[PDB]
Design a protein around this ligand. Structure first.
Ligand SMILES: NC(=O)c1ccc[n+]([C@@H]2O[C@H](COP(=O)([O-])OP(=O)(O)OC[C@H]3O[C@@H](n4cnc5c(N)ncnc54)[C@H](O)[C@@H]3O)[C@@H](O)[C@H]2O)c1
Lengths: 206, 204
DNA sequence: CGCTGTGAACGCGTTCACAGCG
DNA sequence: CGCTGTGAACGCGTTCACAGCG
């Protein structure tokens, strides 16, 4: 009834497997196959899905197109979120060019404070100054991709919170302080690297 | 209890960053209470995570904890890294000036005939076919930044070449031998999690 | 007194056995 | 019968209780 956040991550993985199975022409799957491809047990797959509903067919398995649609629904992918990039350095510029956001995420703003950058035309847009967030965010942008230097993150975050942002995808190696009403999700490649260090040094534990 | 939760390692990483900051600020003494607040966990959490490895307290001396942590995390050595897939993300990573002294880029690989032989910061792009002749004793960690459809195969080549750890930036679940460590940095997953979080605020 | 270190209790996510239905 | 759906046990990871000690 109450969903652990570890399950949401696994649902994201199941949906990717379903998109792949569909691409391969597979119309039907099972908790066992789904588990095998996601490297989790069939038990876990069925438990994860049960948190939201009964999308399978007893004694048969799951119809790929159906589970796919249901998972996209649960995940909020059945809509078009408005996004923006704050910090047009190398990562931000790379993201503006990323051809993989799909139909669920649409870039609508690119902000920064550098005179050189501000004003530069980019894929589907043109860089603007951050103070224009209050006059660009409301009703148009729900999620912000935060790609500024570590020391500028928390600052940029406050400007986003005050601008009425709904969520922050944080790429900066720092814990952000935001009001509980604002969602934050971190993408930390340095932490990932350090975890590999620990893992490699502790094979037994791994 | 000596079965260190993987979730503790992530927090240790955060404690270290907090200590770096504190040291930068000129702070010398800290406590599990101040550390906790800064990491947004309880004082109980901090002390418990540290206890897994030892008794470094007295509170804590910023410089002493910082040293003990980067040691526990293996940051007291120079890891050899390589980038496989020199596209937009790969190139950005090659020029990132924030790896630190603990991580050294020693290889850049690709299959694009037009990128191989291409000079880059601290080296030149080589064909992935050269991995078996480049990884052993020089490169332990590979940053995997090739397209989704190419990731599993590239990981197979890195494994065969002797890689010890793979930092996977592709949205796929990699299959690798038990002895090869894998860590995912998945921004599309983070995006989708935010989507879910925004639609389920009560769920928090 | 104030703060650490750590067994033990506890709540929650995973595992499991089977109930439910096709 | 076969595979999904699920209530409950299990056990891992966080919280708690107190012991040590300057
Ligand atoms: N572009 C971005 O902003 C961005 C941001 C985050 C995550 N990513 C992820 O990064 C990965 C790469 O995306 P990109 O936009 O940089 O792609 P890209 O196509 O720019 O570059 C991928 C590079 O990999 C090379 N490649 C393909 N197969 C290879 C193989 N077997 N061995 C070695 N090199 C190979 C390609 O030739 C290309 O140079 C994807 O998984 C994507 O999801 C991209």
């Amino acid at each position: 009834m109450k969903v652990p956040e570890a399950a949401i991550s696994r649902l994201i993985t199941y949906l990717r497997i379903l998109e792949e199975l569909e691409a391969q022409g597979v119309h039907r799957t099972s908790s066992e196959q789904l588990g095998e491809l996601a490297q989790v047990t069939a038990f876990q797959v069925r438990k994860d899905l049960s948190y939201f509903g009964s999308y399978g067919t007893r004694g048969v398995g799951y119809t790929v197109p159906v589970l796919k649609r249901e998972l996209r629904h649960i995940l909020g992918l059945n809509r078009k979120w408005g996004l923006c990039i704050v910090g047009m350095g190398r990562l931000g510029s790379a993201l503006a060019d990323y051809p993989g956001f799909g139909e669920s995420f649409e870039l609508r703003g690119f902000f920064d404070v550098d005179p050189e950058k501000v004003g530069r035309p980019v894929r589907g847009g043109v860089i603007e100054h951050v103070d224009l967030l209050p006059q660009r965010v409301p009703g148009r942008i729900e999620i912000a991709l935060l790609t500024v230097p570590r020391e500028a993150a928390q600052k940029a975050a406050d400007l986003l919170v005050a601008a009425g942002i709904k969520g922050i995808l944080n790429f900066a190696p720092v814990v952000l302080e935001v009001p509980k009403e604002v969602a934050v999700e971190n993408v930390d490649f340095l932490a990932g690297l350090t975890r590999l260090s620990f893992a490699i040094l502790n094979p037994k534990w791994r």
